[PDB]
């Protein structure tokens, strides 16, 4: 009755949410530095009547759980492309003054010669970009050691450190592969790149998504199948309902 | 339901836009002084319900992002062909009075003896072209030091400077490999060629497109494959839809 | 999946860059006092999960 | 049901990981001093119910297992190229102060006249490189017996020993054909080259990868075929699934 009603309901929304999770987890290929999520089906409190006579409740997905793994990467060969071998996150300023974190390989200049990224999102710490800076020879740990015209020297026009945290599951994607520090994110530490969990700067390259598709295509197929099996359970429930409202 | 609907929609248009981007990025070989674009897939705001129970949205391509790299170049050996070693952009007048910028190696004369390009688009600054000017010995920095008939001297009949900017991503192709100054383009500076980021004049030659094809052919293949995988996701979604409208 | 995608990508661009390097290294005969270049294929960081 | 689901899953990821392993094992030709890896498919615990009524689980790849064999080598004839006949590993300093190990044949000088390699990675022990050192006559066991201008003698400007270990499978490639001592790597011993497993210095030459391709091309073909056969197993499983959700 109401038992099969709510049980079919929670199986329906569990399989629906699983379908939406893997559906959003297949379309996010070529998202830069991306870590993919997945739901975990878990029960609820059971209800024992007598020592063992229980009831049993719950098939619930708890939450979508991230997978912080370095995905595929591409050899792009541009000075405005920097990947990070291993871990360590970037630190860039949002234009409202707040910070941001990412794994990005696409940075630009504004009209006023500052270093920004993603079409005008300034870095942390900020770097002014000249026009006579011919070559851009970036050090592995933030040393923006460019060479200007008439200046035959790798002039360090900027120094950058990498921010590390304690639980990157608490970090949340806040729009176009950006992250900010949350409660469960951990404590920030812009340590020197190459130490304390931070990687180094690979100039010329980008990071991308850790999206394994064919495994999650099998997951799509089996979640569709379990959605249809929940539909079969609803069909049997409503067949009993119509045969008993005939009764 | 609507979740899988919009998710399949944005994966569909992301892969479609990627296919169109690489499709337009393969046909533009032999375009002179050309810098090729590419889209970047990026998420949107996620939606946390509880400290970590999120929702997650976005696979969006942000924009097509240019790659300002010197492509292939050809040895053409004509005085109306001038390439630029390195950087520095040309400055030519549009016939409505406005300026234009390019990396061109094909310039002409009008009926009235002025220096134009691309079939009647005047240079900046303008140069009058005589008829007794036998040889055209162009200096490396705009010195149009031609030698006229009866005048055994490299008569400088024109001086040209090269315009530099601050963010060439803001420059937009405004028709037949032309560019004009935009907001994000940077500040113009027609400095002497050979300094402040400007190159020199290579008389006899042209610049061309930075189009790497086989890498982007692999990109075409994988975007076709991901388009088909999004089609498989739509197929599973609609199979659940038809089996549940059977229910 | 993405693994074979990027692996085929970096093998493709490595062999392409090698082809361009030897291609530019064969046309530069009779260049005066010239010293020729060559690329060196090298790995990246490996990723150990367990000893 | 779930049995065929997880069995198809582990066969799918086993064949996928095998495909990625041989795919990364075919692109690493001309990597210097390289030893190639390979996965090993192995079962899990079986589950006997009665003395023999078992269940049986596992097709798992355990890990990628290196093959420490000397590959192909090339006659390069440069004093900055040194191969090692047989075994024995180099010892070079990483710029953070830590050591490194390799089989390299490409070493350089810095701006400040020290001996480095790979574009500025100093050797262990460090050697200062003069400018009047005309010829570089390297001894077979680290004797950098160069001859300086005005000094008609093989002046030993450096001595080098070779580091040996106990299990080179524990050594891990830490970026651009470098290695460092790990737990399973063994104990280091920079013995004299030519003894205790160490080879000698072949000035003029390099070592390279032990990549046999056509055998591993047959491996690529058969892993593709077994991937398709796992796909056939998934197809039969889902055909039973759809014919039984018809039931």
Author numbering:
A (entry chain A), B (entry chain F), D (entry chain G): 1 to 51, 65 to 260
C (entry chain a): 1 to 51
What does the original paper state about this entry?
The axial structure consists of three morphologically distinct regions, the rod, the hook, and the filament from the proximal to the distal end, with a few minor components.
We constructed a structural model of the flagellar distal rod by fitting the crystal structure of FlgG20 into the previous cryoEM map of a polyrod and a new hook model using the previous cryoEM map of the hook. The l-stretch extends along the D1 domain of FlgG in the −5 position toward that in the −10 position. The l-stretch also interacts with the D1 domains of FlgG in the −11 and −16 positions and thereby mediates the 6-start interactions of the subunits in the −5 and −11 positions and those in the −10 and −16 positions.
